[PDB]
Design a binder for this molecule. Structure first.
Ligand SMILES: N[C@@H](CCC(=O)N[C@@H](CS)C(=O)NCC(=O)O)C(=O)O
Ligand SMILES: N[C@@H](CCC(=O)N[C@@H](CS)C(=O)NCC(=O)O)C(=O)O
Lengths: 207, 207
């Protein structure tokens, strides 16, 4: 059985949750309190969350969790080159996310607008171009078939759209793509409920 | 054929160089000097390096490159769980590298000492303990069988020794582990010659 342990925010665990929910995989979504964290901190290999318990097995590190799940549930591509392609795209999503979190925790007042104007369009052009190399950008990252990295890019697009409602206005492939991921039947309800419960994107309440 | 493009520093490409040298895999080590970089930036999927061409296939992202090499050259463990363990460990190593490089680039004068004292020992103790879970940490991360992550951890330990020569003194498993990686027939003439030429660890010359 699965138990995902993280803080009660989207942050680094959300794409993991998205994968499981969409694919109908039962898991315990274990959102801890700020207050209980200090006493569990030492239970985890690097003293951080997220953690996925697969049976007795402790799996920390969000990337290792995603790639493990990809392999257990056939969301890792159809061959060596596709697996490599999705990992490369996944890593570029995470690189954008590191720039995003930096501005959010460290410089929201002073760097939000330069982020939106000078950094984000440059970084979205890279995803737009890469997405267009499969099925002309009209289906998933690999074209015909969905893979773990589709849930990772969706979350990243979605939180950037919260930050800037017009971020995808000039990237038609990414825009239509976000919209196809959002209306997946396995997700439509979860994202509605998440939306109305006002689940924070980040630990400091800014987004 | 393989061709590895990166700046003429260790930095993010070094673990990939070590994997290939050690294993006897022929590659072109394309060290591009900084002056020529704006001439080629737009040629790569994310406008960054390192890049590995495997035949005609462009592979950016150091992590995607590593795991690609792992699957292709039987350096990714013997089963699912093992693959997940080394991925977990590798991601631990990159997290310390992110702490390391922020200090190097942004705060070498002011934070080098406190990092050596307060941060670095806590982070290494995490590696010491995880290494112990397999074969009492007496061999490689997975036991008797070497894998891609050994090369990543080796590099991260080695550079940290250049920064503080005493950083492994209180970590018996990691100390011995570093020496065991350094003495591999495959990497030692390489490490001798690398040490001869005083190849910079980082792009800003600090180490
Ligand atoms: N590289 C890790 C990062 C994990 C991480 O940064 N976790 C933070 C939350 S964003 C945490 O657990 N903080 C609590 C603490 O370390 O005391 C991953 O991708 O899983
Ligand atoms: N996450 C990427 C990061 C690559 C990266 O940051 N590369 C920088 C230098 S270490 C670069 O190639 N060029 C800076 C630039 O032109 O933007 C990876 O792991 O490969």
């Amino acid at each position: 059985s699965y138990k995902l342990t993280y803080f009660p925010i989207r942050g680094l665990a959300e794409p993991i949750r998205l994968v499981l929910v969409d694919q109908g995989i039962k898991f315990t979504d274990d959102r801890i309190n700020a207050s209980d964290w200090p006493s569990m901190k030492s239970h985890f290999h690097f003293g951080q969350l997220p953690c996925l318990y697969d049976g007795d097995h402790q799996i920390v590190q969000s990337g290792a969790i995603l790639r493990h799940l990809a392999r257990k549930h056939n969301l890792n591509g159809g061959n060596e080159l596709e697996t490599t392609h999705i990992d490369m795209f996944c890593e570029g999503v995470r690189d954008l996310h590191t720039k995003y979190t930096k501005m959010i925790y460290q410089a929201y007042d002073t760097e939000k607008d330069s982020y939106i104007k000078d950094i984000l369009p440059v970084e979205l052009a890279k995803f737009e171009k890469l997405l267009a190399t499969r099925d002309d950008g009209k289906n998933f990252i690999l074209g015909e078939k969905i893979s773990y990295v589709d849930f990772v890019l969706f979350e990243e697009l979605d939180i950037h759209q919260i930050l800037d409602p017009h971020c995808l206005d000039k990237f038609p492939l990414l825009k239509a793509y976000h919209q196809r991921m959002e209306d997946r039947p396995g997700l439509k309800e979860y994202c509605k409920q998440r939306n109305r419960a006002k689940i924070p994107v980040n630990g400091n309440g800014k987004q």
